[PDB]
User: Fold this.
Amino acid sequence: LGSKLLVGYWHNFDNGTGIIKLKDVSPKWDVINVSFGETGGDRSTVEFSPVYGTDADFKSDISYLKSKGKKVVLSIGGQNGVVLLPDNAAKDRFINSIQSLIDKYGFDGIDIDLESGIYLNGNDTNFKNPTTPQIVNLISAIRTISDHYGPDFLLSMAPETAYVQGGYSAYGSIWGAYLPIIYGVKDKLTYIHVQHYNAGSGIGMDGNNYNQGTADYEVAMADMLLHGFPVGGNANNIFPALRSDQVMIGLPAAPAAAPSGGYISPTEMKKALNYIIKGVPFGGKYKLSNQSGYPAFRGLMSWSINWDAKNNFEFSNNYRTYFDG
Assistant:
């Protein structure tokens, strides 16, 4: 896996942007997040059927991409892919169904993109030792699944900001709810790309409120994972820094890809990237925790490959050239 990645979500569905067959995906993407696994009544047995091709055809296309050094990852999420693991029985169905899919199509990892059904229950106050079944069970399942494949297996996640950086403000309900998940799987985690979009405002470690879609916001939000931060206003409860190579930023490929805002122009984002990666400032209000940057910052994720192709390939072309440079 490369040191500066472009990770792109791939629609297993037509939302108006059309379907792109796997072999027609721009090679500028390093990782393809196939979206999404689907769940039925039991909210725990994950299912997936390709939007085009026979099962064998789709499997072959995945093999083709892998042969070119690309990674093809199954993303768990979407409106029709809600996962609830209230007990061991549900956890086991989840594990088995996902492994079945990985076996069937040859995915080379999984992406956790669950944005509902995840809450820190009352009394669940320690991110190193979660108590909420959903959280405990997700961690267990993720570790189990990851351990079932080698020598490498890609594990990523794309929580919304409230679940991660929101932990700076509160620890309970959705606020900080992915922190125990991240911590619980940190030794298996390839990278995390928080969704820096449809997110409104975010509080940085300087206590200032920042607006999504601005260079300051991107730097402020990423810095929390790069540096670590106190949780829920508790100075003695510090969430540890991840490796810089585990930190990415998730962005919309086009303005329309995030209908509630979040899109940032590549010109502005490159300012943020130069600051994060090289410690080169741009006259922004936010001051990076590390003066000389975090050179190992892993790259960018985008929603999505399909949106990108409908927007003059702006995201893929701009950022591939930037990173290669």
